Amino acid sequence: DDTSSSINFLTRVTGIGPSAARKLVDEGIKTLEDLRKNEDKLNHHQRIGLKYFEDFEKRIPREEMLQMQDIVLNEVKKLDPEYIATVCGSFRRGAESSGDMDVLLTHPNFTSESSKQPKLLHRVVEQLQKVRFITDTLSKGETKFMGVCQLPSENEYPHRRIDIRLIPKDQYYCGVLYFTGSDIFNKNMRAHALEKGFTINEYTIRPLGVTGVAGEPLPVDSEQDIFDYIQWRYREPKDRSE
């Protein structure tokens, strides 16, 4: 009813899940001003999302993403030029507007065999915070950073959502591929790969076998490599619609 109407709204809050949304309804929290008078019931994450409820409702236009991309690329470079960073999302696909920033970061020092170098990711976060690009943190893991940022006003921009994932280097391209989408494209390409005797997911590509239940990840040093394995012309992200 007009109340279910309420779980619907809260859920619009980054942090607010259903179960998470449900309880706050059992507490008599429905609208948003409800929420604001009730920060204490909210975790840190839900908290921030509430704080940027609005901004978060707005689309990011190419021009901005672009400048965002530069700040991120450039800062990472001064830390260590051995770091690779790539902005995925429809945006890499040529998209005219985006909803958030998805950054994929990797380093030769970190492979799926290591598995333990939080410093790698943290250091960058730290640097962006220092430059004042990153403005808040929703959560921050060993391998994943979800937060807020904003373009440097000179006078203001809405704050935007940003995510940074640390991926091992030997799993990187697969990841950029995957995170680049689109979804159909991923679907169509995994389907083809299968016809080709190969299974692809967001980490690796692996040959199949009898009975099917098979594997052993092939070395991938670029996106192209993936296409090669399955012998398909190389599609630049823009032609990745389907």
Side-chain angles (χ1 to χ4, degrees), residues 3-18 20-28 30-32 34-40 42-129 131-152 156-186 188-209 212 214-232 234-242:
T3 208
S4 183
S5 182
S6 274
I7 272 191
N8 278 359
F9 182 96
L10 273 21
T11 208
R12 274 163 57 189
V13 188
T14 174
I16 297 87
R22 298 190 156 184
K23 45 175 172 64
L24 289 51
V25 215
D26 274 298
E27 316 274 301
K30 296 175 183 163
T31 82
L32 66 57
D34 266 25
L35 278 180
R36 314 180 156 162
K37 310 321 162 194
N38 286 268
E39 294 184 310
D40 57 295
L42 296 177
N43 56 213
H44 182 70
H45 178 22
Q46 306 167 160
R47 198 186 97 267
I48 313 304
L50 169 80
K51 177 199 191 316
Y52 293 107
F53 183 76
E54 294 82 314
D55 272 6
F56 277 6
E57 282 186 336
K58 317 187 188 188
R59 291 301 296 186
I60 324 157
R62 101 147 44 191
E63 301 286 23
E64 275 162 56
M65 278 311 226
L66 250 40
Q67 303 172 218
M68 22 216 284
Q69 171 191 246
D70 274 351
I71 278 159
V72 173
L73 298 177
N74 110 317
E75 295 298 331
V76 154
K77 214 174 191 174
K78 306 179 298 64
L79 288 174
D80 186 355
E82 205 77 32
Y83 271 121
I84 297 148
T86 312
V87 189
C88 313
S90 49
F91 156 87
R92 209 195 154 206
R93 288 198 322 267
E96 211 55 35
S97 80
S98 293
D100 58 42
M101 177 172 280
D102 202 11
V103 181
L104 281 62
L105 172 78
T106 203
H107 198 292
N109 280 344
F110 179 54
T111 64
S112 76
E113 220 153 6
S114 295
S115 309
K116 54 230 170 179
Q117 332 178 16
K119 294 284 188 178
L120 277 185
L121 168 60
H122 311 150
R123 188 185 182 189
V124 183
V125 168
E126 297 184 36
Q127 173 66 203
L128 306 166
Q129 317 193 234
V131 290
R132 309 194 195 186
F133 177 69
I134 299 174
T135 69
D136 320 49
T137 305
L138 303 164
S139 73
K140 155 172 174 165
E142 56 196 16
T143 67
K144 174 173 63 172
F145 181 66
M146 325 171 73
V148 191
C149 66
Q150 153 177 123
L151 280 178
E156 63 179 276
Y157 290 81
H159 279 77
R160 276 69 159 68
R161 279 286 300 107
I162 173 178
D163 290 7
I164 315 189
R165 317 157 142 271
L166 179 69
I167 308 300
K169 170 132 176 184
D170 53 300
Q171 291 186 324
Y172 193 64
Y173 298 106
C174 275
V176 162
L177 187 80
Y178 184 92
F179 303 89
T180 292
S182 74
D183 287 96
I184 34 277
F185 178 78
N186 291 120
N188 297 154
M189 156 162 51
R190 321 277 263 274
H192 175 55
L194 194 32
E195 282 54 303
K196 291 211 157 154
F198 286 99
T199 172
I200 305 189
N201 60 232
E202 54 300 284
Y203 317 105
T204 60
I205 177 148
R206 314 169 284 319
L208 280 61
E216 208 162 335
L218 270 16
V220 173
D221 308 293
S222 72
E223 264 185 318
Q224 310 72 170
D225 281 358
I226 303 161
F227 284 79
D228 283 321
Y229 283 118
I230 71 173
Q231 51 200 198
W232 231 32
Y234 175 81
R235 282 156 185 253
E236 290 163 319
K238 85 209 195 321
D239 316 308
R240 307 192 198 170
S241 314
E242 78 172 289

